[PDB]
CSV table of N, CA and C in Angstrom, one decimal:
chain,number,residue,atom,x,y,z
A,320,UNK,N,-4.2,5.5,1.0
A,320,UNK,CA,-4.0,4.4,2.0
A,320,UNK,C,-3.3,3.3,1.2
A,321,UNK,N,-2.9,2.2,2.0
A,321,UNK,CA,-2.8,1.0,1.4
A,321,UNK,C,-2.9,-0.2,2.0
A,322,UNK,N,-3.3,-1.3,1.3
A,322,UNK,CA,-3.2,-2.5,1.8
A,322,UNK,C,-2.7,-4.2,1.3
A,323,UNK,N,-2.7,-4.7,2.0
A,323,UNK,CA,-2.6,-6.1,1.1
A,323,UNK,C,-2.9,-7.4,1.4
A,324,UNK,N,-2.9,-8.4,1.4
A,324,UNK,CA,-3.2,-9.5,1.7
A,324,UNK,C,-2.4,-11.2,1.2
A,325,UNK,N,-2.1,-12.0,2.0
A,325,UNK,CA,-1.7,-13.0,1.5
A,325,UNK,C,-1.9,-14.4,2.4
C-alpha cells in the first residue's frame, strides 16, 4: 500500500 501526508 501507500501513503502520505502534508
Amino acid at each position: 500500500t501507500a501513503s502520505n501526508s502534508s
